[PDB]
Amino acid sequence: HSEMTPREIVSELDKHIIGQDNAKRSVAIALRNRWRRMQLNEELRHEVTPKNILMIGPTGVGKTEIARRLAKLANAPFIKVEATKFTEVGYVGKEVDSIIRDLTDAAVKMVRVQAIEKNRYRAEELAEERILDVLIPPAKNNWGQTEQQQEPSAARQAFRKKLREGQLDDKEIEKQKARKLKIKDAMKLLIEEEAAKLVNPEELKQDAIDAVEQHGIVFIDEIDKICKRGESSGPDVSREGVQRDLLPLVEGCTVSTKHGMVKTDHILFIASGAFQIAKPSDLIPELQGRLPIRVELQALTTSDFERILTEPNASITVQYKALMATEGVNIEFTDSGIKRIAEAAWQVNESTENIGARRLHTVLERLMEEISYDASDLSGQNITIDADYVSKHLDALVADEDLSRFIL
Amino acid sequence: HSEMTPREIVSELDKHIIGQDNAKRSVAIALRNRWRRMQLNEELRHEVTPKNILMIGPTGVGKTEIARRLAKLANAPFIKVEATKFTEVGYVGKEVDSIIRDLTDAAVKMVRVQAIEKNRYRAEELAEERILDVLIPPAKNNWGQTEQQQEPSAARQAFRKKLREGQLDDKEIEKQKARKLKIKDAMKLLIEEEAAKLVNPEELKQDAIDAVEQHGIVFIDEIDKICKRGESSGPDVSREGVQRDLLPLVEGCTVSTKHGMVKTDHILFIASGAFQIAKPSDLIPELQGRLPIRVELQALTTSDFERILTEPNASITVQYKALMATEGVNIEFTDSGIKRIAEAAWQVNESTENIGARRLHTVLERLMEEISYDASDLSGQNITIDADYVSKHLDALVADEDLSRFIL
Amino acid sequence: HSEMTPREIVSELDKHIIGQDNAKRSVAIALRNRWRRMQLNEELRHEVTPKNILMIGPTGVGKTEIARRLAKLANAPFIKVEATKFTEVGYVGKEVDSIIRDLTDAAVKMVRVQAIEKNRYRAEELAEERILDVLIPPAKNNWGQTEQQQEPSAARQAFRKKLREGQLDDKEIEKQKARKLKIKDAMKLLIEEEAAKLVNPEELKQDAIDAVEQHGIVFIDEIDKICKRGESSGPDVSREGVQRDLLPLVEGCTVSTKHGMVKTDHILFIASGAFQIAKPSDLIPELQGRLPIRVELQALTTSDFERILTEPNASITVQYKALMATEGVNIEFTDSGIKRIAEAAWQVNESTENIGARRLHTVLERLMEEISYDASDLSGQNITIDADYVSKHLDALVADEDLSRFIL
Amino acid sequence: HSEMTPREIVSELDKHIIGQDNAKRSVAIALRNRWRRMQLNEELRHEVTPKNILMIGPTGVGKTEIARRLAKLANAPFIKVEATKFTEVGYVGKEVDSIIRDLTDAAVKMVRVQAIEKNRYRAEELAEERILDVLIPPAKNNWGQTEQQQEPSAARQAFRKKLREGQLDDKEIEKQKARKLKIKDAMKLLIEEEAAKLVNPEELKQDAIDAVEQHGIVFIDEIDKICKRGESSGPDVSREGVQRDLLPLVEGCTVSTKHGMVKTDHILFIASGAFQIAKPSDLIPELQGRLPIRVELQALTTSDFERILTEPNASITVQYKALMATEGVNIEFTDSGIKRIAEAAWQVNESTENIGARRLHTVLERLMEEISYDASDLSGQNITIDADYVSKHLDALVADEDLSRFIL
Ligand SMILES: Nc1ncnc2c1ncn2[C@@H]1O[C@H](COP(=O)(O)OP(=O)(O)O)[C@@H](O)[C@H]1O
Ligand SMILES: Nc1ncnc2c1ncn2[C@@H]1O[C@H](COP(=O)(O)OP(=O)(O)O)[C@@H](O)[C@H]1O
Ligand SMILES: Nc1ncnc2c1ncn2[C@@H]1O[C@H](COP(=O)(O)OP(=O)(O)O)[C@@H](O)[C@H]1O
Ligand SMILES: Nc1ncnc2c1ncn2[C@@H]1O[C@H](COP(=O)(O)OP(=O)(O)O)[C@@H](O)[C@H]1O
């Protein structure tokens, strides 16, 4: 669908993810190819399959984010499954077909929500006619003048303009209704009925299928945790089993959904792994063939952290300012206050367990717990978060390691 | 169905698979036999059963491809199951019947889509009459001169000629419809509207059964993974269990599908293995019997790699050219460039893990990563991928083994 | 149902199975008894139960064949279950009731198919009247003369005789139809409608029950693999469990089928075993009581092989000739060519793993792979398969043992 | 239900079981108590519960037979479950509730078949009037002399007398029917047609519940196999688990059947064991309590064997005679022949494994194998099975032990 050049995609991604340009390019080329395919002929459209990608990189450095934003960019159905979820199917577990079912169910909860959008205007623009037709019961046989109807568009208008706020005035209208419920309510009930009658139920569910088959995006997390390891053998078979199980989905097959028969031949797969224990070459051969694209994502630096704190759109820092404004408080971070927040996050990560960027959210939240509570009682003020404030609210905690494993 | 001779079958198969002539003939004898059977009497038709085949060879050399093109060439329902998918059902898992079920759900998701092809002219011919009737509401009871309702085909033929792209003119027509609408919709609402009339149920779903029973092709990958190996015993009975479970399917039985009652007695089975650990004679007696045909496939050579790169119809190289064309970019591969692409693929396979022709897809794909991204900013150019280009892009990757286990 | 003397049964069996006369007599007496019972009085009909048989013999020597032919002789529902299938039910597995369910489902796919037989004549003899009544629309009020109707049996006949081949002529007829579909098609659609309206749906499914309860034949393969062994203990319980589980089915009980409540009191059971590890006396006592008949089947000799190759009806040799004729090739086996084919089969069996008669199919197929392919391009010829041809196509393979474990 | 005294019950039971008088009385006291209860007041009817019995004895001596004839003699629903059938549900398997379900599905497959007996005269009396009405279409509104529609019973009584075998005369009658047909069908189509009218649902299915609740008899074989043995502990809790699971059933509870809601509080339970390993006191306390009656059965003696051979009603010997008669063959057993048949049966049991009276069925059956096959070619003869015959046929088999473990 999208007509964005790979370069235009990366640009749009740059709005939510810092660095990891290579991984961006990789994900952009994949999208661009879905367009490139439709430009081909009958034959070549069956042959060319998705160029599935395998992202290799440490925890919390942007792999899922790149995927989510990529799908959210192409308004595509997106599902994220943790590969290891199926390790236990050997004894009893979710079937691997479920991935495509759940892909569909959210691809439905999606096409259905984005239906309430177009049917939220005309859904209540023809919903007024209802309430109005009982405030100015139309003439006995309107007079075809295409303007003789828009006549009250005098009397009529008056009720429309007075129905722009001052309503709540009890009435009665019409399985239609025929009841005598408030206008604030008639209006409400109406939102539904008129909206629904405007929604083609069959093409609705048939469209979710169209989505999954055409723009589906499955992100298999930690696929490296289902590769063979020199620790034992019993598990390896099941681990490997999950690979064989996943095989048809990425090779091309048909799964049964309670909304219809979906084909996976064109879903795009983004596999993810840390690959510290196993190596991509440890995936079964059939799978390595289906993951032609390989890209590494680098670990984040403190400079990366600083930027992630303020640069993205709706970055967590911006979000805080937004939320505090709701309370009437003007929050402001100084360059050093931010340099220092990032600094703390890197410290707990090096000091304890490295959880990537995720660490900024916990540090940031611990730092604002004070303001967050007081906010309301602090309305109309200009609170500034600088190096001092930061250092005064994190240092002690950050320095105390055992406490860090609990509180940050 | 097809009246093709084996020789013509192999020929047709040569358009997609390089080498593996013996497997080609094996699989071709199989198809021609289905024909040979229908040319027989009552008794002999029950007696004669498919000559199931056992393909023996290393990964990615054309086993599945051969079987997939065979299926495609006989418009036959095809399913590919991984044998170990059931080694776990001793603890829970998919029952082997699922195979015939899926081969049915896809033997349906097939007859259905191929009913949209046959009925794609009905809604845009003897059904586009919907808009034209609300455009020029036919005479009060047409007269009748077998050219009288073709007379207009002046006033009429004008609305049809003008209906070659000019729409978005809202009208209305007719649970038929009635509802007022446009044409980018009254027309499309008609696309499906008039179509579900010709396609019925007890024939569409009745025929799927007919297909599976008569032309079904099951490909059982890794059959060798469920033979007995001399390392333990507990897992062996599980393995042999899958063999016993599969027994009813290839010996002749009845399975229950939510579309009817399928009879497997004439499904063609192509089993597949590598047989490095086990040997076909490790299969249970009853299975070896039902697997009369044995054929080996050779490993691929660098020459086969060169040939696979360009000879097949819609070869990866050809597809690539096509895709870049979408960007207004003329890509070109010189004989030496291809010679080196194959060379690299062979190197990595020999130095790391051998994954057959699969390796070509990842090598080729990495080689092009750059052009694929810049394609949009190169429109109107003639990029040549020669030996130089190939070397500058793949040398360093292939040279570094650990790197290859990740990036190639 | 059948009125054949035990001796007449064995005779009819002799048409498909070589030797194993004792096992024949055993299976014949069992059938004959079902008749003998119905000749008894009210009381004695409940008392006399089936005389279940336990066939003891090496692999592939005719045990299943005798059973299949016995059932196919009495047009009885026949099911073959592998006893070990239920060993895993301990952890999760097919219930043993399934045996009687599946018995029923195929006893249905049976009574339903044999319904299309009687309703294939009158199904299309009253289906013509349909197509004809629109080619010679009957008089306005036919004139009751029982011959005044068979009048056109002038005009009328002409269309009938011209409807013996030259049809395909578009028409229209009548949820009836009322559509305007081709006669080649009207005719087709008609085959269904008229046929169906001719089938009593209730007595249909109620008859399958009647079949299973009255002529059911369950062949439990490898029951010896669920007897106790001096290898362990844990399994023995489950192994033995399967015996307790099977117990009610052969002792007399009621199972629930999705087509109705079926009673097993009169199904005939034929258990099968090799009994190399266990002995029949190792079955639990309750079971040994229900298997009053014991018969051994001898291993096959080369003389047995030679005869099995040409003597049965629709023997594999005959089948080949049949299939090759389809191609216009006259195939002929000389007495020595056959003596030699059998000789090879015995050799691979002694040399490698002995799979009984099954070995003839693989040898025979390997031997004809050449002709089978060329057939078409060999039309109109008289190909003879003698000792030379045979020896030239098998010797090398047979002599190479390791190759035999793969290719033969 | 039955008003039989214990003494009369035992008497009636003596017609099928040799010896085991104590078990007879135990089981007889049980039946008479059900009667005794209904002769009581409100309170005492809830309080008084079945006196469940625990039968103790070696295989095949009459435990089940006794319990089966008891059930049969009180036209009571009967089910026989093998206790270990649930020792595996700790990993999966049938829940103990299935017992009451099955005892219901058979308490149905019983009331249904016994509704075809009561209604087998209705379709061939007040329903055979269907054919006679199309034979002599009754007067335009019968007059009315309570002998006027009996007047014909001349023209009428002629069609009824002639309808004593003379049919195949096609007519038609009346979703009633209408469709033209024959009589080997209009008549039979009437058999069921008029019958489903008298039998209703909410009484037939309502009564099954009534039966089970009031007269249900559960026979739990091998109860001793789920007691605690001193070899391990893991399997013991599983065993004791089945005991706890069975507890609700014999203590009083409600189970859910797809036919209604069954109450077990008055189901009679007959548990069964051998008790060589465990002793009844190994059963859990709550179960011993609910198993108030304890009775032992003795092992059978050669004399019991002779007696079992001929005394019971429809004894195997009698059945045999009957079956051979079907062939026009008069079979005869002399006192010494029988003495030797029993002797042989005892020998094998003593020399190999003891399987009680069961052994008689297999010995007797082998002894007759020859006559059974040649029966048809011996019509009109008097074959005597004397001591000589017996010896010539069984001596060699019994003498060879290994042979007996297979053939006897
Ligand atoms: N490169 C990045 N740019 C912006 N935010 C990032 C980046 N890396 C991680 N994050 C933040 O950290 C969280 C970590 O999850 P995610 O980004 O999915 O990566 P991973 O899949 O490797 O754990 C995300 O919610 C995201 O907001
Ligand atoms: N002989 C061949 N000719 C053409 N393509 C081949 C050949 N062998 C392998 N391939 C390519 O490699 C992939 C490997 O899969 P496949 O051919 O099914 O073999 P395998 O069943 O051994 O995995 C396929 O996508 C196919 O396009
Ligand atoms: N005695 C025989 N006569 C004819 N064909 C036989 C005989 N024994 C085996 N066969 C052939 O070999 C195959 C072996 O299977 P089967 O006959 O079921 O015996 P088993 O159950 O012992 O394996 C059958 O399909 C049959 O065609
Ligand atoms: N005392 C007996 N009287 C008559 N028949 C008996 C007797 N004991 C055993 N049998 C026969 O042997 C078989 C053994 O089963 P059963 O009598 O139920 O005992 P068990 O419950 O110990 O197995 C039955 O078919 C029955 O006909």
Side-chain angles (χ1 to χ4, degrees), chain B residues 210-223:
Chain B
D210 308 332
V212 164
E213 295 211 0
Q214 293 288 294
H215 313 303
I217 295 174
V218 169
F219 184 78
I220 309 176
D221 214 21
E222 73 192 311
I223 184 76

mmCIF file of all heavy atoms in Angstrom, chain B residues 210-223:
data_model
loop_
_atom_site.group_PDB
_atom_site.id
_atom_site.type_symbol
_atom_site.label_atom_id
_atom_site.label_comp_id
_atom_site.label_asym_id
_atom_site.label_seq_id
_atom_site.Cartn_x
_atom_site.Cartn_y
_atom_site.Cartn_z
ATOM 1 N N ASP B 210 -13.373 -34.355 -3.624
ATOM 2 C CA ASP B 210 -13.051 -35.010 -4.883
ATOM 3 C C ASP B 210 -11.585 -34.811 -5.239
ATOM 4 O O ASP B 210 -10.906 -35.756 -5.647
ATOM 5 C CB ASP B 210 -13.939 -34.441 -5.985
ATOM 6 C CG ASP B 210 -15.410 -34.475 -5.618
ATOM 7 O OD1 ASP B 210 -15.801 -35.355 -4.821
ATOM 8 O OD2 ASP B 210 -16.176 -33.627 -6.132
ATOM 9 N N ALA B 211 -11.109 -33.577 -5.085
ATOM 10 C CA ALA B 211 -9.718 -33.232 -5.378
ATOM 11 C C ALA B 211 -8.771 -34.052 -4.497
ATOM 12 O O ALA B 211 -8.026 -34.908 -4.983
ATOM 13 C CB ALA B 211 -9.486 -31.739 -5.142
ATOM 14 N N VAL B 212 -8.804 -33.772 -3.203
ATOM 15 C CA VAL B 212 -7.978 -34.479 -2.251
ATOM 16 C C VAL B 212 -7.950 -35.989 -2.523
ATOM 17 O O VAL B 212 -6.879 -36.586 -2.667
ATOM 18 C CB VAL B 212 -8.481 -34.225 -0.833
ATOM 19 C CG1 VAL B 212 -7.899 -35.237 0.109
ATOM 20 C CG2 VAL B 212 -8.081 -32.830 -0.390
ATOM 21 N N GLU B 213 -9.124 -36.604 -2.603
ATOM 22 C CA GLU B 213 -9.202 -38.037 -2.840
ATOM 23 C C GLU B 213 -8.541 -38.486 -4.119
ATOM 24 O O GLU B 213 -7.853 -39.501 -4.159
ATOM 25 C CB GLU B 213 -10.655 -38.493 -2.878
ATOM 26 C CG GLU B 213 -11.394 -38.340 -1.569
ATOM 27 C CD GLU B 213 -12.467 -39.397 -1.393
ATOM 28 O OE1 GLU B 213 -12.629 -40.248 -2.297
ATOM 29 O OE2 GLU B 213 -13.141 -39.379 -0.342
ATOM 30 N N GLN B 214 -8.766 -37.720 -5.173
ATOM 31 C CA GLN B 214 -8.249 -38.049 -6.494
ATOM 32 C C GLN B 214 -6.874 -37.506 -6.871
ATOM 33 O O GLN B 214 -6.114 -38.176 -7.572
ATOM 34 C CB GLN B 214 -9.266 -37.589 -7.540
ATOM 35 C CG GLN B 214 -10.558 -38.360 -7.491
ATOM 36 C CD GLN B 214 -10.389 -39.768 -8.024
ATOM 37 O OE1 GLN B 214 -10.112 -39.963 -9.215
ATOM 38 N NE2 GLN B 214 -10.546 -40.761 -7.148
ATOM 39 N N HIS B 215 -6.555 -36.305 -6.404
ATOM 40 C CA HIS B 215 -5.293 -35.687 -6.774
ATOM 41 C C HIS B 215 -4.420 -35.172 -5.631
ATOM 42 O O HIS B 215 -3.417 -34.493 -5.859
ATOM 43 C CB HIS B 215 -5.597 -34.564 -7.770
ATOM 44 C CG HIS B 215 -6.535 -34.983 -8.864
ATOM 45 N ND1 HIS B 215 -6.273 -36.048 -9.704
ATOM 46 C CD2 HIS B 215 -7.763 -34.529 -9.208
ATOM 47 C CE1 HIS B 215 -7.299 -36.233 -10.513
ATOM 48 N NE2 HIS B 215 -8.217 -35.326 -10.232
ATOM 49 N N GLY B 216 -4.793 -35.509 -4.406
ATOM 50 C CA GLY B 216 -4.025 -35.059 -3.268
ATOM 51 C C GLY B 216 -2.571 -35.515 -3.283
ATOM 52 O O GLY B 216 -2.242 -36.645 -3.684
ATOM 53 N N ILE B 217 -1.694 -34.615 -2.853
ATOM 54 C CA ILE B 217 -0.283 -34.921 -2.783
ATOM 55 C C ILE B 217 0.236 -34.514 -1.416
ATOM 56 O O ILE B 217 0.238 -33.341 -1.066
ATOM 57 C CB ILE B 217 0.528 -34.184 -3.871
ATOM 58 C CG1 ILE B 217 0.123 -34.678 -5.265
ATOM 59 C CG2 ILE B 217 2.008 -34.448 -3.672
ATOM 60 C CD1 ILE B 217 0.757 -33.901 -6.408
ATOM 61 N N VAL B 218 0.652 -35.499 -0.632
ATOM 62 C CA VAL B 218 1.195 -35.221 0.680
ATOM 63 C C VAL B 218 2.714 -35.339 0.650
ATOM 64 O O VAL B 218 3.269 -36.340 0.181
ATOM 65 C CB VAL B 218 0.673 -36.203 1.721
ATOM 66 C CG1 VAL B 218 1.449 -36.048 3.007
ATOM 67 C CG2 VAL B 218 -0.784 -35.962 1.961
ATOM 68 N N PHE B 219 3.396 -34.309 1.122
ATOM 69 C CA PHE B 219 4.840 -34.383 1.185
ATOM 70 C C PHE B 219 5.204 -34.469 2.663
ATOM 71 O O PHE B 219 4.965 -33.539 3.425
ATOM 72 C CB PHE B 219 5.461 -33.157 0.550
ATOM 73 C CG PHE B 219 6.952 -33.202 0.492
ATOM 74 C CD1 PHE B 219 7.598 -33.966 -0.467
ATOM 75 C CD2 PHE B 219 7.720 -32.452 1.375
ATOM 76 C CE1 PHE B 219 8.976 -33.974 -0.545
ATOM 77 C CE2 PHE B 219 9.103 -32.458 1.298
ATOM 78 C CZ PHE B 219 9.725 -33.215 0.342
ATOM 79 N N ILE B 220 5.750 -35.611 3.067
ATOM 80 C CA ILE B 220 6.152 -35.831 4.448
ATOM 81 C C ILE B 220 7.653 -35.632 4.618
ATOM 82 O O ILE B 220 8.419 -36.568 4.457
ATOM 83 C CB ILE B 220 5.834 -37.252 4.882
ATOM 84 C CG1 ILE B 220 4.381 -37.578 4.543
ATOM 85 C CG2 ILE B 220 6.136 -37.415 6.353
ATOM 86 C CD1 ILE B 220 4.006 -38.997 4.840
ATOM 87 N N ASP B 221 8.071 -34.418 4.943
ATOM 88 C CA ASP B 221 9.482 -34.133 5.147
ATOM 89 C C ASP B 221 10.043 -34.871 6.364
ATOM 90 O O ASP B 221 9.289 -35.277 7.263
ATOM 91 C CB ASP B 221 9.683 -32.645 5.377
ATOM 92 C CG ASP B 221 10.981 -32.149 4.818
ATOM 93 O OD1 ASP B 221 11.532 -32.825 3.916
ATOM 94 O OD2 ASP B 221 11.443 -31.080 5.265
ATOM 95 N N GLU B 222 11.369 -35.014 6.382
ATOM 96 C CA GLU B 222 12.123 -35.662 7.463
ATOM 97 C C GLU B 222 11.559 -36.994 7.938
ATOM 98 O O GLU B 222 11.491 -37.267 9.147
ATOM 99 C CB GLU B 222 12.267 -34.704 8.661
ATOM 100 C CG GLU B 222 10.987 -34.486 9.468
ATOM 101 C CD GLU B 222 11.083 -33.328 10.465
ATOM 102 O OE1 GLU B 222 12.078 -33.260 11.235
ATOM 103 O OE2 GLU B 222 10.149 -32.490 10.483
ATOM 104 N N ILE B 223 11.155 -37.834 6.998
ATOM 105 C CA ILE B 223 10.611 -39.118 7.391
ATOM 106 C C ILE B 223 11.692 -39.915 8.124
ATOM 107 O O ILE B 223 11.384 -40.743 8.983
ATOM 108 C CB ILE B 223 10.085 -39.900 6.162
ATOM 109 C CG1 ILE B 223 9.424 -41.198 6.617
ATOM 110 C CG2 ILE B 223 11.190 -40.136 5.156
ATOM 111 C CD1 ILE B 223 8.076 -40.972 7.203
#
